[PDB]
Amino acid sequence: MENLKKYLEVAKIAALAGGQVLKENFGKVSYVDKTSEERIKEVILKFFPDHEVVGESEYRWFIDPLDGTKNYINGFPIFAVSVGLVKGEEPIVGAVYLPYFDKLYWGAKGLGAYVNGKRIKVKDNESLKHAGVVYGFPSRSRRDISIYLNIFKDVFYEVGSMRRPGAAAVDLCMVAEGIFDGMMEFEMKPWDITAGLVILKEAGGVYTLVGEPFGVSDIIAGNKALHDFILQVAKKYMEVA
Amino acid sequence: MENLKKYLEVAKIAALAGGQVLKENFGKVVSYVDKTSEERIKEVILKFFPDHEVVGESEYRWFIDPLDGTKNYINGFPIFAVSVGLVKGEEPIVGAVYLPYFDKLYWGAKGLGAYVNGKRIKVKDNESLKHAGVVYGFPSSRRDISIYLNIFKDVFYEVGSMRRPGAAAVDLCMVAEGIFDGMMEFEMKPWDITAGLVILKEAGGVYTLVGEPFGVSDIIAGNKALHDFILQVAKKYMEVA
Amino acid sequence: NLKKYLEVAKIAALAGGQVLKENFGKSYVDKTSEERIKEVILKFFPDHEVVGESEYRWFIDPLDGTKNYINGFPIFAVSVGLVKGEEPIVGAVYLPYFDKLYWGAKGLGAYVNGKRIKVKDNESLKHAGVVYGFPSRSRRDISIYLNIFKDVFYEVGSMRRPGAAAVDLCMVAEGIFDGMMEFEMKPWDITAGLVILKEAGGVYTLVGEPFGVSDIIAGNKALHDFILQVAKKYMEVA
Amino acid sequence: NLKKYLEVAKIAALAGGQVLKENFGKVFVSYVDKTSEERIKEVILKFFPDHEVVGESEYRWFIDPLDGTKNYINGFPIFAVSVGLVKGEEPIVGAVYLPYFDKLYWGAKGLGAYVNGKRIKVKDNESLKHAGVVYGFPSSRRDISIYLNIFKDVFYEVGSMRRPGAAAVDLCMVAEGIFDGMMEFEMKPWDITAGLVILKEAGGVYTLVGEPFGVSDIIAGNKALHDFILQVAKKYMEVA
């Protein structure tokens, strides 16, 4: 933690470096996915050769060169680059950049959560009918779809509104910014969420990780209210330990 | 209707009138906004055409949506719009939809084409389902939710991706713009889709309206491929006539 | 009908600005623009008069920054101002590229997209920023403007020539620039901007014939007094 | 190795631009400038430890942490970060970032000039009366008159003349085809080196009067305007 602030500024530059690849290529197009990754990898390693990078010790950078690929290929502006860092098992730094909006979300353990310099935080709201929730799950799941459909139906009925933007890292950043009350994505990878979670926690959010935090996981995050409720419902059709 | 041109130009201005209310109030944590936007629109339309009828909540009928995507707008999510559509008798002839946050004005008129801020648009060519992008939306409902979950899962298994942005007028413009192959909206009002529908049609899109075009309806629109696919699936779980 | 003239001015500017927006990066524009502006105005106030290249006059610039617009420089706007008798009371200046709408009305304050604005404070002249402008083929001798330019140049921190008076007035109003100096002006290029600047707590002096060819010196008290100080040394005033 | 120098350059500009970006509007200055400078110099030296950084060997980087300082402090969006690479005495790499507009101009010798992954080129001109020129000079080492005379003669011939207040950005707008040319006096290497590479690869022409790596005056634009505003200059200050 002696160079936490140096890790942060490096995470931010890495996200921007790969975010520029997404920027220059938007609307023109998978070579982008690899070019963004190389750039991110280059920045991290030149600064910290010894660290390990994961995607696709005591310092593991979990990166997502392009979160929201399908949206990116179709032209839907909800996509980003995610750059998270974890010491041992503890996630300590997060950087998520939204190229199309030129919005850079970031945060470090105990240092706060920000978006382009402005401090952010999850919103205050108990009321479920006044709440907004984003969600997401795969098309060819490892788990039966019906389960996800049943969980959806239950929250959908109590919540004020639900949205499926198509990019976990962004969903995580909008919850941390106080736009959406909570989220719930299933069958996630560490690089999909690591950076976003750090930011969410620093913005004062709560979250339950189901499964191996660095393997395949499920995530239920948001303010106190939605987290407990999405979690309650989430365990009627599946198991949590 | 020799004034199509004038009708179009008025629709656009009116959408800009209401959109201005939506943009300068965005972010300011009661929906006096919606009422004010509506007031500006009705006002513009009725100074140019005093005898035309304006619908939303007698040969020419203007269907207007002062605020498509209320939930998103309140929460701080960019996907919201204002729609202004003109119907002569029964035929939709002019459409204008404005995305204030993006300062994007989608417009079109019968036989004159579809446009977005000056550039001509059109639906995409692809007929491959696994590559297709689809947007959907059903309310939280008049009919049993199971029906929507059933139509969703099926399409979900075939298409490349599915999104729920939360504002039908925008879903229609993005389909018209060729970002999404198709859209799927259930239990709509005429002022939710009339404008976006004119636009979609001029972009070369195909669509199926279920129920009374000027009463509660369901809309399935997109390129040929997706419209044929979504419609066929829907017909397995619900009635269309 | 005070709050009503303002809403119409805003919609009129937006209407004309939309034309500029659709064609940016390509006079049909200028013509089409004023066409939309006068049309919206006369639809809401058939008794009012429109002017712009009856106790209620609207001075409009369908496209301020024509040259910038043609080159692809983002500095350009639409200007819609209203005068009652001889007093500027309502103004709207829209900048299509930045999607920023500046508006104001006597007693109601100045705004830019729903945000209230005000001119800036100045303690040191060498910290001030000034925007200026004069024509290439001018009625006055360029020597006069060069003298005015130097004197002001040596005293302030910076001087900029953006190319759109209507936009210069607005930037002084928002407190980006301490003040401006624009010479050989027409009423439709500055009326809407003046209303906005004054409601932003600004000061200004018109030289010549308002609603005619004039000069304009505007900004916070400090720069206005200084720019006017210099001007008086090389030319006519009152 | 040009390709690797260019990618690094873009990143360096972006990094320093981020500082400028998250501090724009917040009425300090030395802090932003210095913080931006430190981030740019760090990235460069990280990929090329042997290179030399300059501004305020066989491979020198001329960087401007914040071009358009006064504009930046005032809140006028015309400002940027300039990162240029020089091999020997020749400008070979250039990256100019405009944080506010989120536009990144870039180029490398023999590779072309771009803006956010968009190939750019100077505009074609015929009539001087249709030309647009950006100018600028310090408040100076030469008698203002000299510059005012040059400005005056050009002013009389072209359609328009603007003074945005940021050389780096100026050179990029000429490269993009917005302005036909620009004249700027009393320049430093870090102010124009990046823009120069970008301009030249956009098919532009420029003349450096003075010491390229010292204090200099720059005449740059397409062929037309460059020749024209070069004629006028040597009519008042006698370029070599």
UniProtKB/Swiss-Prot annotation, chain B:
| One example GO MF annotation | metal ion binding
Which named protein is this?
A: Fructose-1,6-bisphosphatase/inositol-1-monophosphatase
Q: Which residues bind substrate?
A: D68, G69, T70, R163, A168
Q: Which GO terms describe its biological process?
A: inositol metabolic process; signal transduction
**Residues that hold Mg(2+) 1 according to the record:** E57, D65, L67
**The family this protein is said to belong to:** Belongs to the inositol monophosphatase superfamily. FBPase class 4 family.
A Pfam family? Inositol_P
EC number(s) on file: 3.1.3.11, 3.1.3.25
Functionally, this protein is described as follows:
Phosphatase with broad specificity; it can dephosphorylate fructose 1,6-bisphosphate, and both D and L isomers of inositol-1-phosphate (I-1-P).
Catalytically driven reaction(s): beta-D-fructose 1,6-bisphosphate + H2O = beta-D-fructose 6-phosphate + phosphate; a myo-inositol phosphate + H2O = myo-inositol + phosphate
Q: According to the lineage, what is the superkingdom?
A: Bacteria
Report the top EC class in one word: hydrolase
Q: Which cofactor does it need?
A: Mg(2+)
Its source organism is Aquifex aeolicus (strain VF5)
The record's listing under PROSITE patterns reads: IMP_1 (PS00629)
Question: By which gene is this protein encoded?
Answer: suhB
Q: Where does Mg(2+) 2 bind?
A: D65, D68, D192
Q: Which UniProt keywords apply?
A: Carbohydrate metabolism, Hydrolase, Magnesium, Metal-binding
